[PDB]
Amino acid sequence: DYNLVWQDEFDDGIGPDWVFETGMGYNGWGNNELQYYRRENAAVENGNLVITAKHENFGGAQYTSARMKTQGRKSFKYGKIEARIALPSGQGLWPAFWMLGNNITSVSWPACGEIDIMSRINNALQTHGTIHWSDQNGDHASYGDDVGVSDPGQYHIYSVEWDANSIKWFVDGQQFNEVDISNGVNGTGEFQNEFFILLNMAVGGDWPGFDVDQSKLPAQMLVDYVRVYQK
Numbered sequence: 001d002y003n004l005v006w007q008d009e010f011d012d013g014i015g016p017d018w019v020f021e022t023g024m025g026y027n028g029w030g031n032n033e034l035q036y037y038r039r040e041n042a043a044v045e046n047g048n049l050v051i052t053a054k055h056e057n058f059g060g061a062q063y064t065s066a067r068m069k070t071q072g073r074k075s076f077k078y079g080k081i082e083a084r085i086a087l088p089s090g091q092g093l094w095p096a097f098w099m100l101g102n103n104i105t106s107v108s109w110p111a112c113g114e115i116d117i118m119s120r121i122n123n124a125l126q127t128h129g130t131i132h133w134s135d136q137n138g139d140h141a142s143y144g145d146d147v148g149v150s151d152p153g154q155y156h157i158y159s160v161e162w163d164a165n166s167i168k169w170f171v172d173g174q175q176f177n178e179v180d181i182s183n184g185v186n187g188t189g190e191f192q193n194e195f196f197i198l199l200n201m202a203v204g205g206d207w208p209g210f211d212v213d214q215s216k217l218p219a220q221m222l223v224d225y226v227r228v229y230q231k
């Protein structure tokens with residue numbers, strides 16, 4: 001049995017476990033992204049976290065959005081990690097609900113491990129579920145899959161069920177991907193550690209491309225909640 005261990009329902013404001021990131025990181029958050037993240041692009045409305053991507057000059061960027069993380073505040077080793085999210089559609093938009101290993105501080109990326117619960121690019125009727133890590137050879141490895149999501153503008157529960165042997169991905173309880181991590185095979189030992197959660201919406205980058213449909217801005221990513229259950 002899964003029990004609720006943490007949540008953020010965004011009932012009246014952003015809960016105490018979120019840290020806001022700002023700026024463009026290093027080379028556009030490692031992916032040549034175009035937005036400058038700001039605290040100001042995240043708000044709560046009608047019981048939802050609202051991350052807004054805007055066409056706005058700030059800090060030398062042409063776009064602003066928000067990126068939030070639970071690093072140093074809430075981290076999890078295994079669990080059913082889920083979020084109820086509604087996505088905007090527009091060329092250049094790249095929302096994500098994901099996780100990074102706590103040890104990012106000492107081992108860097110991808111050695112810290114990364115669990116992309118949900119990512120989407122542009123107007124795609126597909127979302128992705130992916131892991132990134134450093135295999136036994138010390139190479140940037142990744143394993144991922146996609147699933148058809150025909151109304152991404154609607155709410156959908158994006159989740160992973162993560163345990164010592166596997167990571168399973170779900171959209172609305174439909175399993176669409178699985179990776180075996182049992183006994184740390186192919187350098188996946190890094191997924192037996194604690195991970196924090198991130199939410200963001202990037203504008204442009206290596207994955208969605210550098211064309212942006214600016215007529216779809218301001219664009220809102222809506223997160224009704226983030227919940228973590230553990231057995």
Ligand SMILES: [Ca+2]
Pocket residue numbers: 009010011047048223224225
């Ligand atoms: Ca809510």
Ligand SMILES: [Cl-]
Pocket residue numbers: 077078079080162163229230231
């Ligand atoms: Cl668990």
